[PDB]
Amino acid sequence: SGISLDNSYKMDYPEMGLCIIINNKNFHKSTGATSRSGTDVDAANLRETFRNLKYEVRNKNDLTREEIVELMRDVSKEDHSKRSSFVCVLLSHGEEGIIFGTNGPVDLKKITNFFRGDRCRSLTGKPKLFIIQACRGTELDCGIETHKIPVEADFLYAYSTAPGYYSWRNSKDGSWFIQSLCAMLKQYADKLEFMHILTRVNRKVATEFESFSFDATFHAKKQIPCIHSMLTKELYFYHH
């Protein structure tokens, strides 16, 4: 045939792939973690959004840390040969490097390690997207007025917030990040490359949201999401 280019991931496998959504709203009393009002709005928005992208969506609610690890291990042992990609969305409490099960924290690296290029062979060379709505620390942004491959290759972490910072969730509307992500996917998934979609998400969160709190410490604060890309190709959700 004629000249061929390989700058973009092959996304025309028989299936787009799994979208695992872990929605942790209610936490064991002994953890002292607050209920995450608004997260069901996020989970429903994500389900619809990724449904329209032709992902096989599996929603899981209120998993313990043991259940999260087992779920991830089991999913990583599935045969993904006919799937183009893998998506996992984590909605929970967190710290830097950490996501909360209902009964306590799990290392993010433990979860993602199951999908390493050497450990999940049917996803080797395919994009593995981890979308994370969770805090990464306790900083607040005051704002300003205006032939081998690496086993860590082909991962993308779409973090809701900058390293070290809280992440914001509205109890009625859902989280700022997931709200914005779903809106930008809806509008641009049939026309923009994924990093450019996520950049529009960055702008939306950065410009259209500001916290309101009766507590001066938490009032009038801002958020910027952080794209962490170790992808090796452009990613378009459409093909042909």
Binding site: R36, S92, Q133, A134, W168, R169, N170, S171, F212, F218
Partner: peptide
């Protein structure tokens, strides 16, 4: 508005 709440933090995660």
């Amino acid at each position: 508005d709440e933090v995660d």
